[PDB]
């Protein structure tokens, strides 16, 4: 996964992260930019515009749950496969999310980190998080293997 240096760079940086609102903003931007993903989130209410998604209370709440399990993973970089095994069952067998969407959400979260942290979010640092979100993608997709 991540070398000794990498684990520590990512982790130092994660202490800075307003995780709750990044969570809400990432999932919100997911639903707007890639309309299809709304199909999993019908029961969340009115998702019929940008303004609707971005002020949808359950989208805010769920955002946080999503990013929380992500920050848990940030403490289990060596055992992502393990950390996400129950959620992999949820997304794969119950929800049937195609594993590509794990990558789009990853990518989108990266954009959100970029927006919040500006030029501190260096090419190198981003590249480190790209590995992390790719790791999270795998562990989530694993029970499709």
Partner 1 sequence: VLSAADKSNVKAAWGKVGGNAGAYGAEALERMFLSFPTTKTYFPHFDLSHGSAQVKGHGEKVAAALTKAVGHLDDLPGTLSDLSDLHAHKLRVDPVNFKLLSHSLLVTLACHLPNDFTPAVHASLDKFLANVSTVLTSKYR
Residues contributing to the annotated binding site? 62, 91
Q: Which of 6, 20, 34, 87 binds partner 1 (CB under 8 A)?
A: 34
Place of tokens 């993608």: 137
Residue 76: alpha-carbon gap to chain centroid: 15
Report in angstroms the alpha-carbon separations of 48 from 1, 99, 134: 39, 25, 30
Collapse the DSSP code of 11 into the 3-class scheme (helix H, G, I; strand E, B; otherwise coil) and give the result. Answer: helix
Q: Binding to ligand HEM by residue 8, rule CB under 6 A?
A: no
The verdict on 111 binding a second copy (CB under 8 A) reads no
Residues 6+ apart with CB under 8 A from 71: 14, 17, 19
Binding residue for a second copy (CB under 8 A) from 133, 135, 136, 140? 135
Q: Any contact of residue 126 with partner 1 (CB under 8 A)?
A: yes
Looking at residues 84 to 123 of the shown chain, list those that interact with partner 1 (rule: CB under 8 A). 96-98, 100-101, 107, 110-112, 114-116, 118-119, 121, 123
């Amino acid at each position: 996964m991540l070398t000794a240096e990498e684990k520590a760079a990512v982790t130092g940086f994660w202490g800075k992260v307003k995780v709750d609102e990044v969570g809400a903003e990432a999932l919100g931007r997911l639903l707007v930019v890639y309309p299809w993903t709304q199909r999993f989130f019908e029961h969340f209410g009115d998702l019929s515009s940008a303004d609707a998604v971005m002020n949808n209370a359950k989208v805010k709440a769920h955002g946080k749950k999503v990013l929380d399990s992500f920050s848990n993973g940030m403490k289990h970089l060596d055992d992502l496969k393990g950390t996400f095994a129950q959620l992999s069952e949820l997304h794969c067998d119950k929800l049937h999310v195609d594993p590509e969407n794990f990558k789009l959400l990853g990518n989108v979260l990266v954009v959100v980190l970029a927006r919040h942290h500006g030029s501190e979010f260096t090419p190198l640092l981003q590249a480190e998080f790209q590995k992390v979100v790719a790791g999270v993608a795998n562990a989530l997709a694993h029970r499709y293997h």
